[PDB]
Structures are given as C-alpha cells and as structure tokens.
C-alpha cells in the first residue's frame, strides 16, 4: 500500500541539476549541483507548495559542476567540475576550504569514504585520483581506456568502483591501488553506477538503458533490467530493496525483491512540446528512504514521497 507521490519542487538553479546529495546527520538538508557552476544547500520543510528553500549558494567553480556529495555529518560538501578541479566546501558558510588540482580534463565524479579520510574522483582524462582531505593527490589509478563517468566508494580496507565510455565497470582495491575485478557486459557508454547499501551488489547503466546488476564478491554479472531509454542516474533505496533510475523518459523505480516495477515517474511539463520534455539526470534518497529527490534539465528539483495509497 505504498506509492511514490509528487510532493513539490525546489527552484533556484539556473542550469541542469546534475547531482544531488543528502546526509544522515542532517535529514533536513539537501545539496544540489548544477550546470550553472554552483551548488545549493536547501532547507527542507516539506510544506504545502514549497517543500524547501535555498539557504546557501556555493560559488567558485568556473565551469559545470557535474557531481557532489556531503560528508556523513553534513558539515562538508565535495564538488567535481568540468573546470578540472574539485572543491571541499564548508556547508554552514558556503565557502571553499580546499581545492583539488591534478586532473587534465573535466572532473565527472567525486566521492568520499565513510571516515571522510580520503577522496576519490573520476575524469574525462581517463583516470581515477585518490586525494587527502587537504587537497593532496596521493595516487592516480590507470585502467580505463576512455572517459571515466562515475566513481563510487563501496560500503562495507577501501573498495571503489568505476565506469566509463570504454564499456567497462571496474572494482579497485585502494589498499593496493590496483584493479580487483573487471565487469564486462555493457554494450554502450555507461553514465552511472552505484553500490547497494550492504556493499554486495553493483548497479550500472548508460545509453542503451540496460541496467546491469553485478555480484561484487563473486565478480559476476547476475541479470540486466531493461529501462528502455538512456539512464543518467541510479540510486538504491537505503531501507527498501528498490532501485531508482533516472531515464530520458522518466524515473523508473524497480523493486528487486520481488522483481517488479514500482513506478515510472513522469511529471506533466508546462506545455513543453513532446520533443522538448525535460528529464531527470540526478537522483538522491533521503536518509530515511521516505523521500526521493530528482534534478531535471529544466533546472528544477522535483520531490516524491513514499505514502500510503
Ligand atoms: Mn558517498
């Protein structure tokens, strides 16, 4: 008796909302990144026709901000930018504490370990970099033969996973700075990947809309879910066996146990033309899993909540 219901919007960005992040420490805080070169922290009220408001603007990047995340406590933000750098921000003030310089091209992805002791990034320079929180590059991981689109830390000795336009998904052992597993099977550019909260599964997808699920430990492919259209973002529910996928035609929410389509979220748009309908390119679940945030190509964040029918 549970459905996803459109609750409201968060307006304030002036470019595609490319990335979203929530935090367990601050369940009322949302972080967003945009092609408008900025990030925005939001205060969530969840009230009427204004689910929340912008509290801070994070300005400093000279190009598109592609990815962002918050530390566990929500005190700090990380951003990856096409300007070839990452920045660590003080969420309270909106200031940049540290710059991360080293990539030779667009930085497409950023993530951080649970201890918030080291930072990982992916770039169109084909490399993955490991940094200290003080902005010092420690090492560069080589193996991808094309752009790296996304890098993520696997929840659990740190293990990360990456995907790129070489159709490869890779797991790396940071204790060795070496490849742990090659996941072959994608036939198209991979836009996004993510690890299940228990760190046992990998989900990855891109252009052809094929969402491949991998058994990390066994280093094997399990099955593929057809989303039909290009997938831009994937996000496992923190508390449900649900996998949300932002696609060119809507947000498909898959139940994995048992297997069925929870929903295909498709908002009604203005009167845009069909040809020009905006779509979601970013996703984030709230810590409690009762809220799903999605950033769109019309600069708007849309908010769904799990309610009783
Ligand atoms: Mn993370």
UniProtKB/Swiss-Prot annotation:
It is found in: Cytoplasm. SUPFAM superfamilies: WD40 repeat-like (SSF50978). There is a cross-link at residues 43, 50, 104, 134 (Glycyl lysine isopeptide (Lys-Gly) (interchain with G-Cter in ubiquitin)). Keywords: Acetylation, Cytoplasm, Isopeptide bond, Phosphoprotein, Repeat, Ribonucleoprotein, Ribosomal protein, Ubl conjugation, WD repeat. Pfam families: WD40. GO terms for cellular component: cytoplasm; cytosol; cytosolic small ribosomal subunit; nucleus. GO terms for molecular function: G-protein alpha-subunit binding; GDP-dissociation inhibitor activity; protein kinase C binding; ribosome binding; translation regulator activity. The modification Phosphothreonine is found at residues 93, 159. InterPro entries: G-protein_beta_WD-40_rep, RACK1-like, WD40/YVTN_repeat-like_dom_sf, WD40_repeat_CS, WD40_repeat_dom_sf, WD40_rpt. WD repeats lie at residues 12-52, 60-99, 102-142, 144-182, 185-224, 226-266, 275-309. Disruption phenotype: Defective activation of the ribosome quality control (RQC) pathway. One of its GO terms (biological process) is negative regulation of glucose mediated signaling pathway. Component of the ribosome, a large ribonucleoprotein complex responsible for the synthesis of proteins in the cell. The small ribosomal subunit (SSU) binds messenger RNAs (mRNAs) and translates the encoded message by selecting cognate aminoacyl-transfer RNA (tRNA) molecules. The large subunit (LSU) contains the ribosomal catalytic site termed the peptidyl transferase center (PTC), which catalyzes the formation of peptide bonds, thereby polymerizing the amino acids delivered by tRNAs into a polypeptide chain. PANTHER family: RECEPTOR FOR ACTIVATED PROTEIN KINASE C RACK1. Present with 333112 molecules/cell in log phase SD medium. Component of the small ribosomal subunit (SSU). Mature yeast ribosomes consist of a small (40S) and a large (60S) subunit. The 40S small subunit contains 1 molecule of ribosomal RNA (18S rRNA) and 33 different proteins (encoded by 57 genes). The large 60S subunit contains 3 rRNA molecules (25S, 5.8S and 5S rRNA) and 46 different proteins (encoded by 81 genes). RACK1 is located at the head of the SSU in the vicinity of the mRNA exit channel. RACK1 interacts with the mRNA-binding protein SCP16. RACK1 also exists simultaneously as a homodimer in a cytosolic non-ribosome-bound form. Belongs to the WD repeat G protein beta family. Ribosomal protein RACK1 subfamily. This is Small ribosomal subunit protein RACK1. It comes from Saccharomyces cerevisiae (strain ATCC 204508 / S288c).
